[PDB]
Design a binder for these strands. Structure first.
Ligand SMILES: [Mg+2]
Ligand SMILES: [Mg+2]
Ligand SMILES: [Mg+2]
Ligand SMILES: [Mg+2]
Ligand SMILES: [Mg+2]
Ligand SMILES: [Mg+2]
Ligand SMILES: [Mg+2]
Ligand SMILES: [Mg+2]
Ligand SMILES: [Mg+2]
Ligand SMILES: [Mg+2]
Ligand SMILES: [Mg+2]
Ligand SMILES: [Mg+2]
Ligand SMILES: [Mg+2]
Ligand SMILES: [Mg+2]
Ligand SMILES: [Mg+2]
Ligand SMILES: [Mg+2]
Ligand SMILES: [Mg+2]
Ligand SMILES: [Mg+2]
Ligand SMILES: [Mg+2]
Ligand SMILES: [Mg+2]
Ligand SMILES: [Mg+2]
Ligand SMILES: [Mg+2]
Ligand SMILES: [Mg+2]
Ligand SMILES: [Mg+2]
Ligand SMILES: [Mg+2]
Ligand SMILES: [Mg+2]
Ligand SMILES: [Mg+2]
Ligand SMILES: [Mg+2]
Ligand SMILES: [Mg+2]
Ligand SMILES: [Mg+2]
Ligand SMILES: [Mg+2]
Ligand SMILES: [Mg+2]
Ligand SMILES: [Mg+2]
Ligand SMILES: [Mg+2]
Ligand SMILES: [Mg+2]
Ligand SMILES: [Mg+2]
Ligand SMILES: [Mg+2]
Ligand SMILES: [Mg+2]
Ligand SMILES: [Mg+2]
Ligand SMILES: [Mg+2]
Ligand SMILES: [Mg+2]
Ligand SMILES: [Mg+2]
Ligand SMILES: [Mg+2]
Ligand SMILES: [Mg+2]
Ligand SMILES: [Mg+2]
Ligand SMILES: [Mg+2]
Ligand SMILES: [Mg+2]
Ligand SMILES: [Mg+2]
Ligand SMILES: [Mg+2]
Ligand SMILES: [Mg+2]
Ligand SMILES: [Mg+2]
Ligand SMILES: [Mg+2]
Ligand SMILES: [Mg+2]
Ligand SMILES: [Mg+2]
Ligand SMILES: [Mg+2]
Ligand SMILES: [Mg+2]
Ligand SMILES: [Mg+2]
Ligand SMILES: [Mg+2]
Ligand SMILES: [Mg+2]
Ligand SMILES: [Mg+2]
Ligand SMILES: [Mg+2]
Ligand SMILES: [Mg+2]
Ligand SMILES: [Mg+2]
Ligand SMILES: [Mg+2]
Ligand SMILES: [Mg+2]
Ligand SMILES: [Mg+2]
Ligand SMILES: [Mg+2]
Ligand SMILES: [Mg+2]
Ligand SMILES: [Mg+2]
Ligand SMILES: [Mg+2]
Ligand SMILES: [Mg+2]
Ligand SMILES: [Mg+2]
Ligand SMILES: [Mg+2]
Ligand SMILES: [Mg+2]
Ligand SMILES: [Mg+2]
Ligand SMILES: [Mg+2]
Ligand SMILES: [Mg+2]
Ligand SMILES: [Mg+2]
Ligand SMILES: [Mg+2]
Ligand SMILES: [Mg+2]
Ligand SMILES: [Mg+2]
Ligand SMILES: [Mg+2]
Ligand SMILES: [Mg+2]
Ligand SMILES: [Mg+2]
Ligand SMILES: [Mg+2]
Ligand SMILES: [Mg+2]
Ligand SMILES: [Mg+2]
Ligand SMILES: [Mg+2]
Ligand SMILES: [Mg+2]
Ligand SMILES: [Mg+2]
Ligand SMILES: [Mg+2]
Ligand SMILES: [Mg+2]
Ligand SMILES: [Mg+2]
Ligand SMILES: [Mg+2]
Ligand SMILES: [Mg+2]
Ligand SMILES: [Mg+2]
Ligand SMILES: [Mg+2]
Ligand SMILES: [Mg+2]
Ligand SMILES: [Mg+2]
Ligand SMILES: [Mg+2]
Ligand SMILES: [Mg+2]
Ligand SMILES: [Mg+2]
Ligand SMILES: [Mg+2]
Ligand SMILES: [Mg+2]
Ligand SMILES: [Mg+2]
Ligand SMILES: [Mg+2]
Ligand SMILES: [Mg+2]
Ligand SMILES: [Mg+2]
Ligand SMILES: [Mg+2]
Ligand SMILES: [Mg+2]
Ligand SMILES: [Mg+2]
Ligand SMILES: [Mg+2]
Ligand SMILES: [Mg+2]
Ligand SMILES: [Mg+2]
Ligand SMILES: [Mg+2]
Ligand SMILES: [Mg+2]
Ligand SMILES: [Mg+2]
Ligand SMILES: [Mg+2]
Ligand SMILES: [Mg+2]
Ligand SMILES: [Mg+2]
Ligand SMILES: [Mg+2]
Ligand SMILES: [Mg+2]
Ligand SMILES: [Mg+2]
Ligand SMILES: [Mg+2]
Ligand SMILES: [Mg+2]
Ligand SMILES: [Mg+2]
Ligand SMILES: [Mg+2]
Ligand SMILES: [Mg+2]
Ligand SMILES: [Mg+2]
Ligand SMILES: [Mg+2]
Lengths: 122, 137
RNA sequence: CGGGCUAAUCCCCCAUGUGGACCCGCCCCUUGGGGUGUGUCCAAAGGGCUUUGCCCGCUUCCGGAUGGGCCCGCGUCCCAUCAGCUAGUUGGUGGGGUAAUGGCCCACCAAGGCGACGACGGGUAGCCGGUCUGAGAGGAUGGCCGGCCACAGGGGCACUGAGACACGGGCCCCACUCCUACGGGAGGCAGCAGUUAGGAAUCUUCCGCAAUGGGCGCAAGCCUGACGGAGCGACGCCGCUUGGAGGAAGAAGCCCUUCGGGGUGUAAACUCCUGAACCCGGGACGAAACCCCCGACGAGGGGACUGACGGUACCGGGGUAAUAGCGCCGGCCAACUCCGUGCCAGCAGCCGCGGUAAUACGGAGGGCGCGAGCGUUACCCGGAUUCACUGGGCGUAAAGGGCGUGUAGGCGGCCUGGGGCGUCCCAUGUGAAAGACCACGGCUCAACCGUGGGGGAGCGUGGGAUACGCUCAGGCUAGACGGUGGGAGAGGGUGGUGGAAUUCCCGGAGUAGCGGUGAAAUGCGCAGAUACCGGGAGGAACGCCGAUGGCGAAGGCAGCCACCUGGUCCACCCGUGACGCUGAGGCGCGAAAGCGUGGGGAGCAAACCGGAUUAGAUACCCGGGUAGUCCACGCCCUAAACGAUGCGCGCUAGGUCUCUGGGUCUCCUGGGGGCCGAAGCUAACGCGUUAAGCGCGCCGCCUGGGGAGUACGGCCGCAAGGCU
RNA sequence: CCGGGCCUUGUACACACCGCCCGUCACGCCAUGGGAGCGGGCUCUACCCGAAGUCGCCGGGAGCCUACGGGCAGGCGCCGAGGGUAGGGCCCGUGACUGGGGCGAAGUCGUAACAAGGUAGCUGUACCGGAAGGUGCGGCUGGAU
């Protein structure tokens, strides 16, 4: 377009749409589970994934997917979450953090333990 | 017409692609002063002040490269490139320090100045700047 | 609360006036600047030592110096789905008030001020130096340190004062809490720690004025949560260690095997050497001044006291093998096999892994990369050339406004002169320091810090040059406009009008079916249809000409005639002499359908009824048939309103066809309409003097798909609905 | 009618017509809007009362100091945080019920578009219909032969 136009209308510095609103610009928000259960994914997969619906100090309430195998999550379980969705599971945008609060890490897990809150054996 | 200068330049660039022995342009001391530069640097062969059905002109005599083999024997261009810079839409002004050096020194940029039209180097020599007319190679 | 007493650097009058304040006059100046003269007004404070002199202070007046106040110019985020705001509101006269201009305050006169250069309202945020990213332009950012501002529980106010409308001052009001002897009182951590709460999370209720700096004091000294340090926290950066050398064709265990073997693996073990920490001895720099001695309380030269960190670093002697953890191994992206499992349990940042031979989950072996770190999440720049100034784009991928007219604005052809706004050069003041950048210097390096050096943009002052931009003036005719003479045309509007056909009515004649389909049926017909002849009424569209044609900005326009009128082209080269292009807004036009009012109504024809095809047939085919299609006046304003191609100008081979002009009539030249194609462009298909080619100016427009041209608000409208 | 060969053409198919794909109704999750209303924030206008406090007048029937042509107290007033009455503006949240939309899928009905998709398709409007959609008027070719 004309330089004039660029002088009249300039160009639009399009901003970003955050992908974790329920956080309120925070890296971690505590919640309290409300609907511990399983959730099937959309194609092309099949399973029964471990979801957690959590109310937050941010007032909101969102599904948080429980990573790993075997957990200890039921209603009233103090928990923490993190940013990160699960492509195949619409309705889930955030993760939970094992080994934190009323959530414990994975059992007999030895590799990538950090990502699964599981301390060191012998 | 808006900018005869680019038009001038445009006329050139338009013929050099078709390989014209010469071509014409409406005249003006400024257009000439320009052209003055464009043979002293060697892109053109020079101009003479012709005259068409009552009107002045500037039939510019064009210079091109040598015939070639391969499948495209057409003679390489002297003026590989010639584009306007400062314009009526955006007048462009430079200080002596911020005067560009065309294509690492193989081209030039004609500059209008209080001390006559100059080349990218002539200005730096004279220590001035001005309305960057165009860059050419 | 009250009664009565006493000192002073407290307060008051008088005197002295160098001097300073005010009025009025006059010189200079030029906004209330300095000097001058008469009338008027005003200063003060003592205390101490070694005592006719010193030091400290006190009074005024000029100046310096620093710290300020007020005012100006340019710059400073998001939404126009905020388009209008304004009565102290803008100006003036006159007073108040302050240190001082001021509508900062009051009174009165006037009717004015701001705004698409985005006023008014809303949302957000403390700005700058800098900080990070970045090749850069630019973006994001404003903690720490440095400067300025604003606040001191939420608001208002004035006093004290050189200075505030004051955080640890005061008055009141509100909200809150606490104390209490129940009559009443108090408080304000956003000072240093600390508690409680909220949160993903941010520390010690430590030492000391030794240093630096600050207040007070002549000094001694005092205050000092500023400041100097200690501690906590891998929070980030820097540095260091968990060892070094020798060490088998190579222990065990462990993983793989084609069972011969392979891998871990110089790794260990063990030999030697070195010696983190932990033990003792020593033990600082920072600290030289104030002060005291002589001199002169001065220059200068001598004299001591003092160290929080701390018995710390650091120096010496001696001396122990002394933590390794994390991510990753399908591609991006460096690093491979084995079991378990079997679209289950699971990884996932994207493309995607798993359904009995998984380099993609889990474990293990082994391996890759960093290394007291390793990873994840969050957010910022980058890659994003994906808001493109550098540096993009709109024929079919998202994007040309339906078309015109025209305001503001942007932009503007040849030649001469003045001015010197942009613009360029030189000088010069500011552009604090910290930081960034180069050189070097101290902690044994580095991180950190010190020293010097070296620049700019930007704006303030003076001078200069004049090419382009601009402005003022003078000429010109190559863009535009115009005069003379013509030409073609479904250009638009009103009024008349001509014939063919369909439908119905009337008359004559005539008989067993017509009509309709792929085939049939509904339907019409002995109450006489169909096909024929004759006459009449009514509405609508104009056959051949006619076409790859023409006109129109577009939608669109088609029998003939006349009138009213527009645009347009060619020639002659007669006049004006840049008068121009574009065009956010605004305005007008705008096919069909649709709306309102009043006509009109033959043919056709949504909905509707019927008959058929079908599994069904709310459809495609058939028989009827209402609005509507037609006219007048109003709206409605959308579309595949298409060339899916904005408008004007200049430059860039041609060939063939066609419309209309001019010539000299073979042919040449103008303007439109198609075709193939030069170079060139283009992701390709394609375009190509009617560009989608090389360019200049201006407008509109795009920024993944869907959600959606939907919701909200606003405007328009009778409504359906339109615009944004 | 069945199969195959070559050329061309169109194609939204490439698991290749046993393709691809549209819409209503069914179920599940999420999200926005409409909605008799309720709940809170912000802001504007007018009026009543109005604390401290500066400022302006009075200081007498009248107290105190004298610095006595005065000063303080003390009285009246204008402005005034804020409180109250009433009425507008804007935004957030919430709401019986309601309207469509998105994603999931392995269901139900039919088969609208992509080939001449079996009635060429799309489009504006208008009407109709369980739904994709049909149809009438005009328009584009992005229509096959
Ligand atoms: Mg799967
Ligand atoms: Mg909670
Ligand atoms: Mg529990
Ligand atoms: Mg994430
Ligand atoms: Mg890991
Ligand atoms: Mg440029
Ligand atoms: Mg006395
Ligand atoms: Mg006196
Ligand atoms: Mg003051
Ligand atoms: Mg005012
Ligand atoms: Mg008046
Ligand atoms: Mg302006
Ligand atoms: Mg704006
Ligand atoms: Mg900021
Ligand atoms: Mg910050
Ligand atoms: Mg600061
Ligand atoms: Mg405040
Ligand atoms: Mg306060
Ligand atoms: Mg507070
Ligand atoms: Mg307060
Ligand atoms: Mg206070
Ligand atoms: Mg203050
Ligand atoms: Mg305080
Ligand atoms: Mg505190
Ligand atoms: Mg807590
Ligand atoms: Mg601290
Ligand atoms: Mg001290
Ligand atoms: Mg001191
Ligand atoms: Mg003394
Ligand atoms: Mg004492
Ligand atoms: Mg104290
Ligand atoms: Mg400090
Ligand atoms: Mg070794
Ligand atoms: Mg010791
Ligand atoms: Mg020392
Ligand atoms: Mg030692
Ligand atoms: Mg060892
Ligand atoms: Mg890693
Ligand atoms: Mg992997
Ligand atoms: Mg593989
Ligand atoms: Mg890597
Ligand atoms: Mg590899
Ligand atoms: Mg993993
Ligand atoms: Mg894929
Ligand atoms: Mg396997
Ligand atoms: Mg380290
Ligand atoms: Mg990014
Ligand atoms: Mg890169
Ligand atoms: Mg870039
Ligand atoms: Mg692009
Ligand atoms: Mg398109
Ligand atoms: Mg168009
Ligand atoms: Mg104009
Ligand atoms: Mg000019
Ligand atoms: Mg001039
Ligand atoms: Mg100038
Ligand atoms: Mg500096
Ligand atoms: Mg060194
Ligand atoms: Mg330095
Ligand atoms: Mg530099
Ligand atoms: Mg400079
Ligand atoms: Mg200057
Ligand atoms: Mg001049
Ligand atoms: Mg101009
Ligand atoms: Mg002129
Ligand atoms: Mg002409
Ligand atoms: Mg003319
Ligand atoms: Mg009829
Ligand atoms: Mg008859
Ligand atoms: Mg008849
Ligand atoms: Mg015809
Ligand atoms: Mg035609
Ligand atoms: Mg003439
Ligand atoms: Mg003349
Ligand atoms: Mg125009
Ligand atoms: Mg219309
Ligand atoms: Mg119509
Ligand atoms: Mg009607
Ligand atoms: Mg009606
Ligand atoms: Mg009617
Ligand atoms: Mg009828
Ligand atoms: Mg019909
Ligand atoms: Mg039925
Ligand atoms: Mg039937
Ligand atoms: Mg039917
Ligand atoms: Mg009919
Ligand atoms: Mg009607
Ligand atoms: Mg109707
Ligand atoms: Mg109608
Ligand atoms: Mg009608
Ligand atoms: Mg329009
Ligand atoms: Mg067409
Ligand atoms: Mg056209
Ligand atoms: Mg369009
Ligand atoms: Mg263009
Ligand atoms: Mg002729
Ligand atoms: Mg032609
Ligand atoms: Mg062609
Ligand atoms: Mg070519
Ligand atoms: Mg191009
Ligand atoms: Mg044309
Ligand atoms: Mg336009
Ligand atoms: Mg989207
Ligand atoms: Mg979108
Ligand atoms: Mg629409
Ligand atoms: Mg609405
Ligand atoms: Mg609408
Ligand atoms: Mg066959
Ligand atoms: Mg054959
Ligand atoms: Mg075929
Ligand atoms: Mg089939
Ligand atoms: Mg549903
Ligand atoms: Mg709602
Ligand atoms: Mg309400
Ligand atoms: Mg009242
Ligand atoms: Mg009052
Ligand atoms: Mg009083
Ligand atoms: Mg009030
Ligand atoms: Mg009020
Ligand atoms: Mg009150
Ligand atoms: Mg169809
Ligand atoms: Mg079909
Ligand atoms: Mg079809
Ligand atoms: Mg239609
Ligand atoms: Mg219905
Ligand atoms: Mg129908
Ligand atoms: Mg049609
Ligand atoms: Mg049309
Ligand atoms: Mg078309
Ligand atoms: Mg087609």
């Amino acid at each position: 377009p004309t330089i004039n136009q660029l002088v009249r209308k300039g160009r639009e510095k399009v901003r970003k749409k955050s992908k974790v609103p329920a956080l309120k610009g925070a890296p971690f928000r505590r919640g309290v589970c409300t609907v511990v259960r399983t959730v099937t994914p959309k194609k092309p997969n099949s399973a029964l994934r471990k979801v957690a619906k959590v109310r937050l100090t941010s007032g909101y309430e969102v599904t948080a997917y429980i990573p790993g195998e075997g957990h200890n999550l039921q209603e009233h379980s103090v928990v923490l979450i993190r940013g990160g969705r699960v492509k195949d599971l619409p309705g889930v945008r955030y993760h939970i953090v094992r080994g934190v609060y009323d959530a414990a890490g994975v059992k007999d897990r030895k590799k990538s333990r950090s990502k699964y809150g599981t301390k060191k054996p012998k | 017409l808006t900018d005869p200068i680019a038009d001038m330049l445009t006329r050139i660039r338009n013929a050099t692609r078709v390989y014209k022995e010469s071509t014409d342009v409406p005249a003006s001391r400024f257009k000439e002063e320009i052209l003055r530069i464009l043979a002293r640097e060697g892109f053109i062969k020079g101009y003479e002040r012709v005259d068409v059905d009552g009107k002045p002109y500037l039939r510019v005599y064009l210079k091109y490269g040598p015939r070639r083999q391969g499948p495209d024997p057409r003679p390489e261009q002297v003026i590989h490139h010639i584009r306007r810079i400062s314009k009526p839409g955006r007048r462009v002004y430079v200080g002596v320090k911020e005067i560009p050096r065309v294509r690492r020194g193989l081209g030039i940029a004609i500059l209008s100045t209080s001390k006559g039209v100059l080349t990218d180097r002539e200005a730096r020599k004279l220590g001035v700047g001005g309305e960057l007319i165009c860059e050419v190679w």
